Amino acid sequence: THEQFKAALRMVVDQGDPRLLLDSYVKIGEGSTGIVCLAREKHSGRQVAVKMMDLRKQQRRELLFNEVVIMRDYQHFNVVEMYKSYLVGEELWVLMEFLQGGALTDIVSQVRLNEEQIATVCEAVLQALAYLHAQGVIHRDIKSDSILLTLDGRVKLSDFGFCAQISKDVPKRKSLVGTPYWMAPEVISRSLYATEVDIWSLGIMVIEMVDGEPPYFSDSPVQAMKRLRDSPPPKLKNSHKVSPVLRDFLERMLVRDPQERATAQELLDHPFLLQTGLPECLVPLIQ
Ligand SMILES: Cc1nc(Nc2n[nH]c3c2CN(C(=O)N[C@H](CN(C)C)c2ccccc2)C3(C)C)c2sccc2n1
């Protein structure tokens, strides 16, 4: 029942009503589970982003635990910070850092990144993934929308709602979870899978950074999923434009066999990442 689920969720959040510890609430966007408001912490004056999501209105309410548990448990230089979380009425509120550089999706819809910029983004995402994968966390929703930027070009992985924490008793999942165009073939097939699915989704995000959109984006989501499931691996449209070293980097991610697919640790050691830039190199994309 709703109250039973609410009581369980309550075990993982900070205690109390946060409404009087915040002011200046302004709605700044919406997302799949709810809204995001900017607000100000009275005690400190710190501006925070607050995700607000109704426990009754979700597709799969159990995934609300991920909104809190993952950032509670896991911290990293390239992972968004959570400050506090609360239950307010029938809503879960999660207080997060406000990243003012926006999402990578809003850059790639405008311009193509150069290779130094692609390597900078990939190195940051791979450091977060190597760390999360080592802890048994599968993200399951890697795509440019999940990548947020600070004003000085620091890259942070966000959107942990679809996460799976695997364990010794259930070391693999088989659920159909993700965003269609970025889902690995083994996820679409409902085969047992683990961390490798995030490497395939990162390869689709590299295609977004080179081409502007993922493969099959003119198809409906189900039709794209059928093509990803059955067809040979997708290619860059702009394959002619990229270095041999970048092409090799991407080829090692978009591999159908999940065992042969590169791990995050393997990719961190790839020569493509020898020419990663400084955070500053992304700042021209945000101004
Ligand atoms: C809304 C918004 N947020 C920005 N900065 C932020 N800083 N911190 C955060 C955001 C947006 N955030 C976020 O969770 N958004 C997702 C959507 N995905 C695609 C990223 C979402 C929102 C509501 C419900 C479910 C999911 C957090 C981490 C709070 C910025 S910067 C310029 C415009 C802008 N507009």
Residue numbers in the entry: 386 to 672
Reported in the publication:
The p21-activated kinase (PAK) family comprises six sterile-20 group serine/threonine kinases. In contrast, the type II PAKs bind the Rho-family small GTPases CDC42, RAC1 and RhoV, but are not directly activated by this interaction. The type II PAKs are important for signaling cascades that regulate cell survival, neurite outgrowth and formation of filipodia. We discovered that PAK6 is inhibited by its pseudosubstrate sequence.
The small molecule PF-3758309 was designed as a PAK4-specific inhibitor, but displays in vitro activity against each of the type II PAKs and also PAK1. Though effective in mouse models of cancer, it failed in human clinical trials. We go on to determine crystal structures of PAK6 kinase domain in complex with two ATP-competitive small molecule inhibitors, PF-3758309 and sunitinib. We obtained crystals of PAK6 kinase domain in complex with either PF-3758309 or sunitinib by co-crystallization. These co-crystals diffracted X-rays to Bragg spacings of 1.40 Å and 1.95 Å respectively for the PF-3758309 and sunitinib co-crystals. Good electron density is observed throughout the structures and the conformations of the small molecules are clearly observed. Both co-crystals were obtained in the same crystal form with the activation loop in the extended conformation and residue S560 phosphorylated. Kinases are often classified by the conformation of three residues at the amino-terminus of the activation loop, Asp-Phe-Gly, and we observe that the DFG flip status for both PAK6 crystal structures is ‘DFG-in’. The ATP-binding site is located between the lobes and is occupied by the small molecule inhibitors. M481 is observed in two conformations, which are both shown. Finally, we determined two co-crystal structures of PAK6 in complex with ATP-competitive small molecule inhibitors. These co-crystal structures will facilitate an improved understanding of the modes of targeted inhibition for type II PAKs, and may aid future studies that aim to design inhibitors specific to each of the type II PAK family members.
